[PDB]
Structures are given as C-alpha cells and as structure tokens.
Amino acid sequence: MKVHEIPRSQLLKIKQYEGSFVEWYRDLQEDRKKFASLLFRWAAFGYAAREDDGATYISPSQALLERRLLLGDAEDVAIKFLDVLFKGGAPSSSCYSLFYEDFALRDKAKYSGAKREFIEGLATMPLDKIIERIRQDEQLSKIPAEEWLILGAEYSPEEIWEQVAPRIVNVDRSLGKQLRERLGIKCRRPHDAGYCKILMEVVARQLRSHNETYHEYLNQTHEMKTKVANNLTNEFDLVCEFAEVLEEKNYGLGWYVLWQGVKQALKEQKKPTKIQIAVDQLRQPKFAGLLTAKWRALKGAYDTWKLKKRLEKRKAFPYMPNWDNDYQIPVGLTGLGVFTLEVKRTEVVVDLKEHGKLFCSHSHYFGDLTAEKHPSRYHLKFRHKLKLRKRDSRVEPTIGPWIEAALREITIQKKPNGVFYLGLPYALSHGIDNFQIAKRFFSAAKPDKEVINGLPSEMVVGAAALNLSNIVAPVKARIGKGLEGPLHALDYGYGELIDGPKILTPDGPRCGELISLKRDIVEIKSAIKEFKACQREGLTMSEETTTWLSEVESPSDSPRCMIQSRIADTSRRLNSFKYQMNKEGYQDLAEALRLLDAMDSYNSLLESYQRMHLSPGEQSPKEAKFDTKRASFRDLLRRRVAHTIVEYFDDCDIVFFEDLDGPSDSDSRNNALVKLLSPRTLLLYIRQALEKRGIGMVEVAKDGTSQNNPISGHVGWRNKQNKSEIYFYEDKELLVMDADEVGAMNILCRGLNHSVCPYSFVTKDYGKRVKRFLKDRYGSSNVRFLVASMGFVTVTTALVGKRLYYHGGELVTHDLHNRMKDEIKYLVEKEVLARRVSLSDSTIKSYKSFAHV
RNA sequence: GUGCUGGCCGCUCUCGCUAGAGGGAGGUCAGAGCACAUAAUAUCAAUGGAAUAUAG
DNA sequence: CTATATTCCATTGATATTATCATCTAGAC
DNA sequence: GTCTAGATGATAATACACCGTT
C-alpha cells in the first residue's frame, strides 16, 4: 500500500459552501491552537524567550514547577497520556476519547486476524515457538507462554478465544477519557465523533512535529561540544589566542587572513597590504610555532576554531512554536469524518453529511476526471491538458497519457486571502522493480548475491551533466548480461552505447547579451558608490568613470544626471528581455537563468540607489516590501529542467547523475553563483519527475569526472582560455575531445562501476568505496604505500598524509600529476596541431576510464 | 484550478535639480506557452544593502 | 580608495520532523 | 440481507562520505 505507491497531490478551489461549514472549520482551528498550547505546557519543554532574541530562556525545571501547579493531582495520568500520543501508531487510535463525551469503551479486545492465525494452530505448535511470537506483541505478553500452551492443548479454539479476550485488552485505552473527567475538559462539540477524531489527529501531528525536533536539537548541541573537546592541539591554542587578540583590537580572523598573514610575515612589503594588523601581529616571535607546523594540522586547527566559534552562538533551547497559522484539515472515508465524492459534467460535489456540501471547479491537471465508488476507496482517471487561456490560440492543443490512481482522503485549508481549497491526494501505481535495482545494487559498492541472482537480463541506462551553461549533456546506452561491448559494468557484465554523447540543448543566442547587462549593473553600482564616497571629501571624479558615464545620452551633462540616465537605460533594457522572452513561454532554459541574475543585481542596484542621499553617522533600516514574484519564477525554472531531462530518458530504467554541492560558508568566494543554479533543489525536482514514471536515479561522486580520458584513463589538461576543450597527450601524439561529453561519459563509467574506482585519496583507506577497490585490484585492503621511481608508487605491506592520484592504471604522486599537466600545457603553447577524436564513433574497443579490472 | 509579462495615464510618498530617477495604489491596451507534490513546525549558512571603526 | 573586519534588517538556499487508512461491530430498516 | 456510522488494529526493513595546493 505505502510501499509500491507514489503519493502526489493537487488542489481544487471551493467555489461556494452552504450549511454550517465555516463554524465547523473555525471551531477546529481555535480548539487546535488552544489545546496545542495546553498540551505543550503539560509536557515540560524548555524554550527560549522570543522577546530578547534568545538572550534568556525558560529552564526545563521551572516548567515542571509550573506544571505541578497547573495540573494538580493528575500528574501521573497526564504523563502516560503524553507518552501514548507521542509514540503514536495504531495504539493511539482511541485517544480522541479526551474530547468526546458519549465515548463508549469495549471491555473485550478486537479479534484481529493475527489472533485468528495464532488460534488455529496453537495446539500443533511447540513450546519453543510460544516465546518468540509473544515476546514482541504487548497484548499477547500478558499471558505466560506455558499458559498459552496448556490452554491450546486442553481447550477448543473457540473457548480459548472466549476466555483469553478480557485479559489481552489494553487498559490505558480509556486514559484520555478518564483525564477529561478528572480535569473537566470542554471542547466546542462534545457530542460529535468525527469532530473529535479530526481534532485529536491534528493536534497530535503538531506536537509530534516539535517533539522530534526538540530531542534532535538537544542532542546535536552535544556532538559539536565533544568534537571541540577532542581536537586540542598547539596550533589550535595558537590560532585561538590569535583570534582573541584580534578581537581585543576588533579585527577578527579569517582563513584568507590566516594564510596571507603567515606568508607575508616572513617577507617585507612597501605598499600598505590589504591586511596589516594581522601581518604585524605575526611579526612577533609569539606566533612562530605555527610557521613550522604542517599544513594538515593547520587545517584541523582552523576548522576546530571555526566550529568552536559557531557553538558559542547557540540558544539553550529551541523557540516555542507559533500555532497561529492555519493547519490543513484532513477528512477520510472510515471514521475520520466522512464524505462522498461524485463528479458531474460541470462541477465536482463534495458532501459532508451534517456540515453541508462543497462545490468545486474543474482543473486541467485533473482533465476528464472520472471517479467510481469502491468499498473504501475511489478510482480516478485523468489526463493532463494544456492550459490554453488564450481564447484564440495558434498552438495545437496537446493531451497526455491516461493516469490511474486511488483516492481515499481529501484536505481543506484556508489561505490568508480567505479562499478555501480542496486537496486531492492521489496515489499512483508503479512497479518497485527498478527502484530496488537502483538503490540496492547500483549504489552499494558490495552488493550481495541475494540481489545479484535477481538482477534483470536486460537494461537501458543513461547519464547527464548539469551546468550553468550547456545545461543538459546526455548519453544513452544499453547494457546486457551475456553481451559483449566496450562499456564495462562491475559484477554484472558489459555494455554498449545506443546514442552517443551530445548536447541536448545548446545555449540560445540571447544568453550572451544577458551576461554583459549584469556587468553594466555591477559597475554602475560601484560607480554610484564612489560618486557618494567622493562628496564626503569634495574630490573630483576619475576621468575614466566620466568617460564611461558619457556614452548614454543625458538631458543635461551633469555626472549625477549621467548615472540617473544610465539607471533608466538598464531598466528599459531589462524590461525588453522580460516581455520578449515570456511571449515564447520561456523556451530556452539556459538563457532563462541569466535573466534571473539580471533581476537579482537590478534589485541591489535600486536598493543602494534609494540611499544615495544619506548623511554619515546615521542608520537606515529597511522597509518590508511584500512580494512573491521571485519565488514563483524560480520554482518554474527548476520544474521545466526536471521535465526536460525526464522526457528524453522515457524509455530507460536508470539514470546516472553527479552529486553537486550546494552553497557553502563565508570562506568560499562563489556562494552568489551556485545559488543561481540551486543544484540541490534541482536534483530534488528531477528525482520526483523520474519517480513518477517508474525510473530509478543514482548519484555518483563528482571528484575528477571532467579531467580524465574516457578511452585510456589518462589525465588531461583543461584549457583556461577556452573552457569547452580538453587536451590529452598519448603515444607521443596530441588529442582533442569535448569537455562536457567527457563529463557525461565519465559519469556513465562511474555509474556502471558503482564509482568504486578512486580518483584521488590521501593516505592515513577507511572507506567502503576504496577498501573494496584495494582488495579487488591490488590484493589487500590494508596496505602501506612507498614512493619510488620517477613518481610512481609500489603498494606494499612510508608516506603519511599525502595526495596520491591515479591515471592510466598506475598510481602516481602529486608532483608527477602536476608535471604531466605542465608538459601538456608546454606543448599546447608550442602550437602543435592535434586531431580530434569522437566518443560516439564505432571501432572503440574498450573504455578503461574509471575502470580498474 | 495555482504560477510566471510589458506599453501607456493620472494621484500619492522618497531624493535631487545646469536634470530627472525610484516606491505604492488604480485605470486601460495588449501578450499569453508550459510546467504543476500540496501543507504546518524548527534549525543552520549566506546574499544584498547601510553605517562604524580603522590602519596604510 | 582598495582591501580585511564589527552591528542592524529582510530574504534565500538547504535539510530534518509531522501527514496523505483498514477492518470489525452493533443498530435500523 | 444491506447500509451506516462508532471503536479498535504484531513485528513489517535497505547507499556513501569531510582530512591543502590559491
């Protein structure tokens, strides 16, 4: 049920409601946000005061000292009630008895099916099997095993069941009822059952959302403390006291400062260096210990200091949740409320029995929707339709394939603009075949024979690249057990291409016009900044700045009129690329990402242009504009790219992707450029689109997947001038390939080999992905390494903490790796002509890249 | 059904003027293809701006 | 004027939790 | 019989990695 089904959802807006529906909704919301606070104040939770931004906090002890006054003699009961609702599951089905007045318990337990199959064969089942079955089940654990055996032996199954039922009844199932009598709890509809069932099931979700976050945070604030407490070194203390003195003189320490200071401390400068305080402080003999310290220890001393600094900025406890925002009310078909759905020609009717009907519109996401009632579910058939809002259109209306799903619940929610929405969570049906093949086999470096014997006899596989430019570069293939071809797949056999590497979509002609329009904005920003900082000293503009300002025609010839005209020029030149690239419905995806950065820099330009008139020494707080037009144009660009990848690999079983890394901390200098691509959400939007069609997906390591030879496994040099070319030097000959195709082919190659073959590692090799490699190729997982010859190595059973590479099948040293790149470079500036080779042509015999067998 | 777009006109805020640029709200003319898993809570990092030290 | 660095304020990228029922059972007609 | 609501349901699974070199 919830194993081989894909849960998706969508919403229909409720056009009109009749009956007591609004009273039903608002009572539920108000009772939820009241009893959530009441339950939060029972289970003593520590929390930080929102008033002072967590400067002070409420301890977990005064919460107990206050619950004692708030609750009274009922501490024992409430503790059990909270635990039962926190653990959840099946046993928490009868907790709605706290809000219901007409609740009726059952002194006899329900005769479940498992009880049935436990009853037919109790007599013919020996004593050693009367302990394992019952040690887990709590209900059955109320009777000793020997009593079970004797009862089964000398009684009739009916008279075992009739006798044994009263004891196995859970006693704490009326706990929520008895608490209501003890405290006199009054909800708003005490004589209704669906209301109570909905209310308790919604309150429990919001409390179990905070319980797991609380207990996780209070543990996460301990591992960092331990990690700092372990990494104590001399370099750590040196860096810490250096940071302390720089903070005494309000400088502070950064990684760039920690390397420039070290290097420039030894030498002497003439012009004032960007950093002077730090280098001067390094001049002192106090900080001479770290000058001879190894780099590996220095990194562990700096990272430990950064981690210790982050921990000092932690609140004692998480904030208290904000219950004010409305929840999403669920109503089902078996007990948890009730509804009937029946599709008409022009409307969809939802009938809440005593709470009135709801009339809903049709959508193009549920086109041609038909619903047939079944015993405890619905059957849906709908086709996605093209949403042509233009009355007269010039595009042919497209339809989609039939989709079948089972619907069993609906949701109602109220948006802040007072519009109710009906949500239909529907589950699609697909095989669990290839998801298991992807997750179980293609990802694990050491799959077991249990799955290996069950691998299919044929497959289709693919690969792709994701970059800011040339977004998708795919390659198709076909592997097959008992088949011969160039590609090699570990533990499975061989393979062969069916569609050679290429570029799915080249970047459009408008993608180069949008990259200079951002330089214009950045330079006009700095120009305006200098145009403001200069007036403080009453100086004069630089000639080059004025000449730059001159070209755009201004009404006057004032400099501050030139910038004011250029700001208008850029606005009028960006608004031309919105209406003109929207008219086409955002056709080319590559050029629709540069426009996003155009917008982003334009907002900062205006943000700094609205403050050009200020005076020194004051402060200018922002103003909170209300907009969501930048989070709704970015959420379309990560869906279109996901759909484009899926539609191409529609006749494939598995697709291989590299695991890109998201934006990082302040040390990295390119956080503002990987936030445009947003790789980690793009890889999440791709996965859902693939999963909707029963296709697996594997993420392989990206280390060095763009600087090898797909054929021979040798290293290559990437031209800095031209970023779409990579050069190789083999057999005293110079070869040329394409850069992105090399990435796609290497992604496929490490996909088929489970990426178990390494690219670069630094000897202490502690890793399920390299340990198996050492055994499979060299012979032992535990081996020592000693350098020899001209830069090769000889694996034996010394060097510690060194960066060893791998090219051509033999490990090398870092110096040799640099020198091969240098010789390729030295030869390429000698203008030696090279011949291009293709990865899609035939007559290639093997693919040794990232292969190690 | 949700989402994403500009031309143009008065009103009203912000700044400056040898001169105009930006924000909010409204009216009107057009354009309009292609994607859609929908929500509640909590935590971390940074981006952008402003000011302040500074040294040199 | 170009770097390093401190405080304030939205706003964004990213990842964790909570969810997307089934099967007796007693009463009316 | 056939609906139609209210009160109660064994366990119930799947990968891997950070340690220089701009």
Residue numbers in the entry: 1 to 764, 777 to 809, 815 to 870
Question: Please, what does the article write about this entry?
Answer:
To investigate how Cas12h1 is activated after target recognition, we reconstituted the second ternary complex, which consists of the Cas12h1 D465A mutant, crRNA, and target DNA in the absence of Mg2+; this complex is hereafter referred as the R-loop formation complex (Cas12h1D465A-crRNA-dsDNA). We determined the cryo-EM structure of the Cas12h1 R-loop formation complex at an average resolution of 2.76 Å. Superimposition of the structures shows Cas12h1 undergoes substantial conformational rearrangements from surveillance state to R-loop formation. A comparison of the conformational changes in the lid motif revealed that in the surveillance state, the lid motif was mostly highly flexible (662–670 aa invisible); then, the crRNA:TS heteroduplex helps turn up the lid motif and stabilize the lid in an “open” conformation where the catalytic site is exposed; finally, the NTS turned inwards and was loaded to the catalytic site for cleavage. After target recognition, the lid motif forms new hydrogen bonds with the heteroduplex (S666-A(10), K675-dT(-9), K675-dG(-8)), together with other new hydrogen bonds between D667-Y302, L676-R634, and L660-R680, which stabilize and keep the lid motif in an “open” conformation. The NTS moves ~18 Å towards the catalytic site for first strand cleavage. Moreover, the crRNA and the TS DNA form a 20 bp heteroduplex in the R-loop formation state, in contrast to the 17 bp heteroduplex in the interference state, indicating that the TS has partially disassociated with the crRNA and been loaded into the catalytic site for second strand cleavage.
Cas12h1 is a compact CRISPR-associated nuclease from functionally diverse type V CRISPR-Cas effectors and recognizes a purine-rich protospacer adjacent motif (PAM) distinct from that of other type V Cas effectors. Secondly, as a member of subtype V-H, Cas12h1 is distinguished by its relatively small size (870 amino acids), functioning as a compact DNA endonuclease guided by a single crRNA with proficient DNA cleavage capability, highlighting its potential as an efficient genome editing tool. Cas12h1 preferentially nicks the nontarget strand (NTS) of target dsDNA and indiscriminately cleaves ssDNA by collateral cleavage in the RuvC domain. Displaying a “Crab Claw” shape, Cas12h1 contains a distinguishable recognition (REC) lobe and a nuclease (NUC) lobe, with the two lobes connected by the WED domain.
